[PDB]
Design a protein around this nucleic acid. Sequence first.
DNA 1: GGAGACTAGGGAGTAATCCCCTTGGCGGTTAAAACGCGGGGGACAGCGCGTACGTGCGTTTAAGCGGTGCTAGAGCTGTCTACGACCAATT
DNA 2: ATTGGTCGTAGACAGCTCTAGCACCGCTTAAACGCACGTACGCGCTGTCCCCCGCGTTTTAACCGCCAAGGGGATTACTCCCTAGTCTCCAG
Lengths: 76, 74, 74, 76, 71, 74, 73, 72, 20, 20, 340, 341
Amino acid sequence: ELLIRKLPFQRLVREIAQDFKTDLRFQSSAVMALQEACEAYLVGLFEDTNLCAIHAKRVTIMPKDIQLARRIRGER
Amino acid sequence: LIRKLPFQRLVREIAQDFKTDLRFQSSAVMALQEACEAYLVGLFEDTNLCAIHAKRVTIMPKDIQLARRIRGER
Amino acid sequence: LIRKLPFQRLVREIAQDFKTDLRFQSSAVMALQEACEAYLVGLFEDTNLCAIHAKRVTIMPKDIQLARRIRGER
Amino acid sequence: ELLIRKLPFQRLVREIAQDFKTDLRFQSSAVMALQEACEAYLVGLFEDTNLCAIHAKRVTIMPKDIQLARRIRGER
Amino acid sequence: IQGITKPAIRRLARRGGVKRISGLIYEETRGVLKVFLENVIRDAVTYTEHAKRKTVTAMDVVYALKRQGRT
Amino acid sequence: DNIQGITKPAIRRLARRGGVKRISGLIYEETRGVLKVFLENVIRDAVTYTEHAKRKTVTAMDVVYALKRQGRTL
Amino acid sequence: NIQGITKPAIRRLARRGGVKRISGLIYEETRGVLKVFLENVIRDAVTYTEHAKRKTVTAMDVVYALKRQGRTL
Amino acid sequence: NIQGITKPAIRRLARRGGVKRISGLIYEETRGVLKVFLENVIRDAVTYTEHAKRKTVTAMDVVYALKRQGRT
Amino acid sequence: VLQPVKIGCVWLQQFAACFL
Amino acid sequence: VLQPVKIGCVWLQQFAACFL
Amino acid sequence: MKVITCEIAWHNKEPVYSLDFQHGTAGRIHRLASAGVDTNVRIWKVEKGPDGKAIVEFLSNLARHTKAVNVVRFSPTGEILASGGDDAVILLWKVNNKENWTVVKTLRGHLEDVYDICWATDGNLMASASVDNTAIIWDVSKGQKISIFNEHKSYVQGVTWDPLGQYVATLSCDRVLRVYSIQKKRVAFNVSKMRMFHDDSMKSFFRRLSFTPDGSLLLTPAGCVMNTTYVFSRKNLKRPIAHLPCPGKATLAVRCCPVYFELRELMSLPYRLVFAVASEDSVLLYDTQQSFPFGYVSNIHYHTLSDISWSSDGAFLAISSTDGYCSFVTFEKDELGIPL
Amino acid sequence: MKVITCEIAWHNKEPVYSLDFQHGTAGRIHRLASAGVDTNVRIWKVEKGPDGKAIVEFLSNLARHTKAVNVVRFSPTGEILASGGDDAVILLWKVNNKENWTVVKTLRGHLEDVYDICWATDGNLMASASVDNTAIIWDVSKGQKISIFNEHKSYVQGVTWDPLGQYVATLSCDRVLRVYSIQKKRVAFNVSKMRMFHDDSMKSFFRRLSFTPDGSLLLTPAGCVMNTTYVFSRKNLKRPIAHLPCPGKATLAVRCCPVYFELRVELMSLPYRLVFAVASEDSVLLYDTQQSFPFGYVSNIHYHTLSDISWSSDGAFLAISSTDGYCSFVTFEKDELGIPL
DNA sequence: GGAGACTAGGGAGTAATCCCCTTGGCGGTTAAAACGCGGGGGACAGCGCGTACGTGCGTTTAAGCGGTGCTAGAGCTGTCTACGACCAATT
DNA sequence: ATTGGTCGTAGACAGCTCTAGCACCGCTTAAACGCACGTACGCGCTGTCCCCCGCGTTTTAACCGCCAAGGGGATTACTCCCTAGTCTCCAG
């Protein structure tokens, strides 16, 4: 379920919107749907990195492993 | 750059499994050769990545199954 | 997805323009079909990209002349 | 055939180098290769932007043009 | 962009099954959060302008799911 | 004279797919021109690759390498 | 048959992959990976060519398989 | 760092780039363009140098890189 | 909320048969 | 720089042809 | 009759796509199987309570499917369970969680969502319909493909096997019906115009039509005049004899009870057959002899219906919807009619 | 003889790849064409001065090529100029900038750098050598390709047409020579082991070998026994009669003067002798038919690798091109090489 | 407005982290052989091609007028004119 | 050391943008039509088989040195586990 506060997400969304172009209204249903998809994707890559670290035979995590996962995805 | 005919009859035998009397044109043959070589070079590169990641120079299968689980294989 | 017979006429005519005594595969012909389709549609998104920067909706050739000069294939 | 002040360019590329990997020794040949790539790509880009601005009918050039060209390029 | 609170990151991590977490996790998590946020909003507005609309809609994010393959 | 084989409504609905609403009729001829010149470009490399395999018949694989040369693989 | 993935051929393909040091069990786990992904890709490829009412697979089928597997090239 | 390129240098290179009337903010997006371009080139140079086990970056490395992205 | 309307076994006329 | 060494027409022996 | 709606989520609040009763059942207790997005096939135990209301008992879970499942089918003998879906793998489950099932043969060859499966009367032949624009004939004993029908140009959302084993009736999303002769392995008939069927605007993923248990008549849902259900005959498949008007939403399912009932007329034979038609939000119950429907249930599900199924004896009529909830229709002893 | 070095940049300091004299010339003034990285083909006017030193006069610039040009060839009659390069397009220039040239036929079909072109004696049939592992036979009058030779497995850097019009000699980077009969259009002979030639490490982009003007013998440079230049014969093309030792840098160019000289160890036995020029990376050796040892040798005249050499119509000029952007000429006085037949 | 949460902050302690064998499995070496490359009929049986067929929804002309390209006049602003100061730079 | 390179200031106006103005040629049917599409099917024919022989480069086995994966232990370092204000999200 939801574990991220609505207002910080909405205010960063408005921040990037006003960076791009003003007068772009955001509806509550679309905002919450995009937020839940956001949480789903981020947690998905999160346990992706968790399994990566599990192979890394070191229970503590360090983000360079996450960046390996990034170039596995080829996002950047 | 796998050797041509051993790979081609690998493909032929594994195609006969679905149903016999299957003819494959050389065009599609080099096409699937391209596909296999592209996949293998990509996976091998990522294995090298996660291997130097594993802080061991020598390659280990555990790297391979790792890559599978991240690449959505199983 | 665009049309078939006129494009087959096009490819055959340009083929005889190159050299006679040649044959085409049906699958290869349709492959050329979607290839040209993709290339032209991509050019046309470029066209839209320029026209929007041209801050006009309707398009005049100078848009596509940009498309080509800017990428410089000719 | 160069106009960018060569040692400021060398210090720029060096400081970029130690941002990623420390203690990278660069010779004159590598610096001039980086240069020639630099002026080549920038003059091509400005050729692009100027002709696009001519299409724009506007004498002045503003970065909507360069953003236009790069959104052509596929770099983003 | 600061709005993604680090304790939220840590509790989502606890849900993710991790045990010990390096501190510098937060900044790169936020960065790759916003890159996909940007990709999705770009695809959303791409469909929206073809729809001649100005407001985000769930159909846009559904098409984003379809395009990226996360459906 | 098959060049005229690419018609007004076809190009109009490709435009519809392209991302435009209003386009003038004066663009159809330049559209066929750009199409013909770049099919010339692509099929030149296509026939070269075809000759490379001692082939008198073109193959769908050829256009692949043609777009790789042109930088628009698909 | 299945052992057609030749051991020094695996070695040279690893070379082109930038691999440093290679062990034996790789030489057949590579056979496993090759056989399973080719099973998959020729599966959807033969399906695609069955859509064309065609009894022979095409490079078109292969490239669509690569799109579906996210390795378009 | 990125300020190694000066605004007058930008202006003169633009001038021989065929432009006459220029706005200010170009002086900053050009730096972003330059870094975006050079990161890929230097990354490929690092890869080639590690392939050849040469710590120093050579001219031919950069030349073959430029061949790879196709602006030899 | 929904208001259920149930019709028992009557051996509905709005759904009468129409032929051609 | 280079030091030019030119040999005129002498009707050298380092390049004498050897047959087989 | 009585109608009982299942208000507990069968597949964890996910839409239900298919339902099927065990055709091998011969007593009072019937075995029902369900398909959902949870990639699991749940076989339930359905039997009347002391008061006559339907009671559902969970038996087994079938999670072998990697993706969503759209259609679940029992063999006419009830031995083998057919299941395919988003992963497009047709599993032939067999009785090996109160009970257990195991897949016998892997009838692979489909690409994505497989929507309609019909068992042949012998049970050794399969008709497979999926989004992939094709219909594939399989051998159950062989477990291998033997014939291909890919003439469909849109989503193949409905197929049934002729009980007489002569033709193959297919419904695709292109508002076109295709009849395939079983011996020629080619198209027997093509009807598209009296359009006749509903276009893509119809919201149900299924176009499941079924032959009459004797095969004499074919009932096709999702039609147009307005939404209706046309009736065809073996004598002429190129012109419908009559249509059953269903104003409101479009019909999507046609299922016929496998029990022949005595006459208390679309077709003229000494026996009558009661069949169930499911629309998006309403169900109309007809019989062979009476043109008007003798039963009608509506406003019982909050979303679109997906599948219906008759019991072996006709005492149960399961109804599945897309809201994650199901429902049943219970008739008393021979309420529908006198069995032959 | 005298050697004059061109110290002025012909193509704006870019490396020069090829040189060719107008075979249609019949007097004292000869027309020379050059190819460089600048995508231009410059035809010059070369003539002896009052002191006998060569004089170079610019005539025309040919910038139709979109990319660099590696090989430039004149017709045996001098009418049509063949030019191809990086853009992989073969142009048939014709006399329609002191003068002007126009392309007649576009002999396309090649892919990348075209390294060697040879004109057939009749002038109606073309041999083209390019990196693309193939040699294509063309029709000059038709302007269309007619035959394909794809047996090359590496960079094709040298080809010549048999003056007798029977075979085709090709040299590729794979240290393998391929002989194609002009009648069968198949491989007649193939020699790879005596390696036989030099490998890819040799730094010249060209492996230009040429037949003897009578076609009796074939002179193949860039050989290994040390660098050498093997000689074959029509009697047996599978075994060298002799090789010319050139220790140091590898030979890369072989050109034969089109003037038959009278006889003044012998490589071949006919009443006439032929003087040919061999250019290595930094040295040029001048031999004749009758003498095993060379009667001329010029070196240390160019700062970088030599690219191409060319004989004049009368043999009085021997142009030399290098990769440093500078060229050079060798001037012989009246019948200095010998008395023409 | 008021109540969960987070942000700021000690404790150490468990978790990385680098050093030290350490041996055993792995990197080149050798001999040949064993499949790897190839080419040649054989025409048999697989393959596409053209055209006929028809017929029907896409293709073609046009009204037509008005949403959209085209022109005038701002008009108000950020260069680039000159420059006076700093100011990094080659040796 | 000096020396050319740079930087930042002052405003005239050139020109990008905004508004007003204008006409004219993309939508939008209605009707003519045509070739697009679908199968047969005879005719062409292209890809081919596949064996062996030719013949030859690479594969495989085994050796032997030796590099490294992993163990051990000392070493530091970083979230507990509250402690506490806070602050603001959300409900009233």
